[model samples]
Target chain A: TEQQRRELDWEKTDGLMPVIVQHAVSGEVLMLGYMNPEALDKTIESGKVTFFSRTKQRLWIKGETSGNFLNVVSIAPDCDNDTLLVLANPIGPSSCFGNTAHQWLFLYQLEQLLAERKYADLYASGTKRIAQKVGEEGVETALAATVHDRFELTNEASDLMYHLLVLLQDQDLDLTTVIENLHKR
Target chain B: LTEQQRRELDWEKTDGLMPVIVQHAVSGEVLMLGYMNPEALDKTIESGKVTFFSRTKQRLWIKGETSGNFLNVVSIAPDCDNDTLLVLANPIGPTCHKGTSSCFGNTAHQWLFLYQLEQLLAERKYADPETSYTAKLYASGTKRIAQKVGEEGVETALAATVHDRFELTNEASDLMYHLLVLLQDQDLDLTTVIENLHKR
Candidate 1:
């Protein structure tokens, strides 16, 4: 008994169905693609994004060709039951074209833009240097980089955040207390 | 599930001690292996935490129970080594059976592999766009992006037919990469995928 239900006949359109990928946060429409039954099954099974190739007449996975994965949060169906919506967090950059218009446009496009912009700023300002070193290196560099790098950017932003968390702990402040202060702010 | 009933079943009976292997349920990382005597097993059952008889202490001790770092049991299975048991569980903190995240400490080999993969993704996404296929997929719009993943899957299946294990392995990697990119295109993560698997 599988928890996910699918329509057998819907995939019969040469075994391809349109699927949209969106950012969970900013709700940017990142990209859109098609999926065959096998591709759809693999997508559902792997939680990783997958699609069908019209030219190649086969299945393709998004990040396989390029490392920029959508980092899926969830997948759902549209009212017609033929279409699928995927919500994900992007790793590194959003577009495969490196911020080109050919960049997949989904709901969270604005957020992706903002994140990319913020990352750009941090990189330029050297704040992301620590993050780069830590993410590229390890936590040891993260611990050392904490003094200079401090910003809420992306997952790499965690390097600074983790150090701040430790610092806050040193000050006898827990994460809940910080959140409470933010709520007050 | 009474204590007596649990004991009556051979599930509790191992050659006086059950070899329990602790592993990370999510990452599939094997954390540690230990043994539990009947008394230690009783403590585990009673507290819903793993406990083992200290061979040195000759007494039962609840693992991390006092420290409030408990292992939540997912499932348990007896190995072909009938006396051996595999305890699949989620740890609140870490589970080394020792005091560390893992008993073996940090091995450079394992860490390097993960680091390298992370680096590859980073380079693909940020540094070199033209050279990195991963970056190209992100740059490519949805239509072409989906097609690439689908093609990789087919290639993997075709490669599997060949006798070269290395080719098959590389193809499998290709399939996984495409799948991940596809997931990225869809905004899904591996954790969600695992959750769906568990649901199935």
Candidate 2:
């Protein structure tokens, strides 16, 4: 990750570039902000779209003025790291509470697929059994991260996700329940 | 839908090609409308990835073949009169040149696919006349289906009055199912009804 940062086009734009904010549910572009390395890390850590305000010379959370924040859903640096696309759920007029139902269904289908017969025979073991695979995949994912093979890391991480989802079902909970708990937190 | 039948579409309207509107599955936002010849359509159907015929290149190209930003096909519904296709897809990555969500405005969409169900009901009107429950509803004729709709309507009303939400949903589903069957039996559909609603 440290080496790749140098490979990024940050050098092209004085170590800062434009980031586009997107609505996760609507797929709409909400706003544009700028991100330096620190602000990008802040956005990733804070779960709020943070931008380096070139004008203010400060790392700031967008909508700090109007309280119309973009709550981060997921962030992706584009195929080229020169640009960043941040998918966010809006905290303003778009009611974040109304989306749990849709999010529930989206994950419900995924949960069902994770429980399908083919994968069922694989991961539908006891909580301990399935939970064990989760740890295995996590270690493999950590190892892949060490080796710095992006594709291998992606695969191992997805494998970790599969096993973890199975563990959730093994414990008789689901993604929606986790989301509900997240809301509580 | 069969591949041969898909190929038999009115490509004559566009010199052996037609427009396919790709849409985001959950967001219902129009991602990008791409042109597809029969060959492209065949490839799309087989691979479950959106393939298009690039007019500039004058050749076929798969949408995500190079970019991994594949629009994974969820369902394909033909529009009224069957000249166009509305493709619902789950996109792996952004669909815009600048890396926004969609080509149109990065805006989202709605799951307005009661039309897809209506389309399926429309298909049963032309099926083998005894294929499935949808066909069974058709073969039973309008009078019987109308009676079933009335019965379901009454049941739905009763469930609502009794405040049983579960029963209400079941009865409502039954009522709507029978209503569609009756309409299909009489050569009507939700779209026409929707158009009438629009007039109002």
Candidate 3:
């Protein structure tokens, strides 16, 4: 990593180069700051997005106060080797923790896909099959969990989730409502 | 919702602009990250090339418009929250202005076998529908494919309910397989689904 630093065009940027902080998963540009040599080294070593606070003229680890630290994923310099792009995961919703959103994102997409499926020439079957799937999957998921088989438990839970989506579609229900119900509960 | 409305990103959430992460389609290497407003995204979609709202220049700038190292679009998906974008593109030449394949150093992406499976499914489309079950699924049309998803879903669920771990695992495999097929039949892929998940 140090070798890559030596390649930076520090001469062009004086002592500080721009560092762009990005949410690794969602691709959100959280913030843009500057990094000095010490800040760069510290960031690389600490696995946190540290920056040379231009205002205080001191080193600052982002989210030190908010506790929303940008945990590093990968760091790379731009083509000129002057600008740094830091891919990170924010740890709190108040600031960001993009990773936690990963599972839900998949669920939402699954829901969306199911919605499309429902409209793709409805199966012309009674809603009984869909409801049966929901109950069966739910029972299996609970059983798997009770059995304490982590592998089988995840598998069952996934099946349950998909079936529930199918059931929701047949009922003209939205995943959003189910999510909302969970929030209230 | 209309496709255009569904694809409309959350401009208001990000203050009328969003960040764009450009990645090499083949290498899966992280290239440069740029910003894009609605106009920039539209132009990109229209041209099948990447264009960013240059914060510095305060105007739209087509990547490679000046350098002639355009990143041709392979696919573009907004993250789940609809506030950011991930663009997969094939670069004509060096991606960085400083003459490098990537802004980041070369490190190929290592990911789940599911992606390989998705790619495998993509390849199966060319096989003779008569011989390949996968191709047959495609030939059978979306309704049958979706119905198969339901059946697999129920079977996977039932396997667990019956306390059959072995059956559950195999059934889960079938469920995932059919789900992937359903996704592909709908012109969707797992990565997009994952990106959607990333946002939530």
Off by over 4 Å in 3: A24-28, A78-80, A94-185, B1-31, B34-61, B66-120, B127-151, B159-174, B186-200
For each candidate, give the TM-score of chain B.
0.54, 0.52, 0.52
Model 1's TM-score against the true structure = 0.35
Off by over 4 Å in 2: A1-91, A94-185, B1-110
* iRMS, all models: 24.5, 22.0, 12.9
Clashing pairs in 2: A26-B108, A27-B106, A28-B106, B27-B109
Query: By DockQ thresholds, what CAPRI class is model 1?
Result: incorrect
* Number of the top-ranking candidate, with lDDT as the measure: 3
> Could you say which candidate leads in TM-score?
3
TM-score, model 3, chain B versus true chain B: 0.52
DockQ of each: 0.01, 0.02, 0.11
| Local accuracy of candidate 1 as per-residue lDDT tens digits, B1-200 | 34443445354444475556554544433445566876776677667777877666787877775676677766555433244445556788866445555543442112123223433554455344577677876677545655554454444334433334344445445444544444444444333443332232
Score residue A142 of candidate 3 by CA lDDT: 42
CA displacement after TM-score superposition, residue A135 of candidate 3 (Å): 8.7
lDDT of 2 by residue, A62-87 (tens): 77888988788765544445555566
DockQ of 1: 0.01
Preferred candidate (TM-score higher): 1 or 2: 2
State every prediction's TM-score relative to the real structure.
0.35, 0.36, 0.49
lDDT of each: 0.48, 0.58, 0.65
The candidate that achieves the highest DockQ relative to the unseen native structure = 3
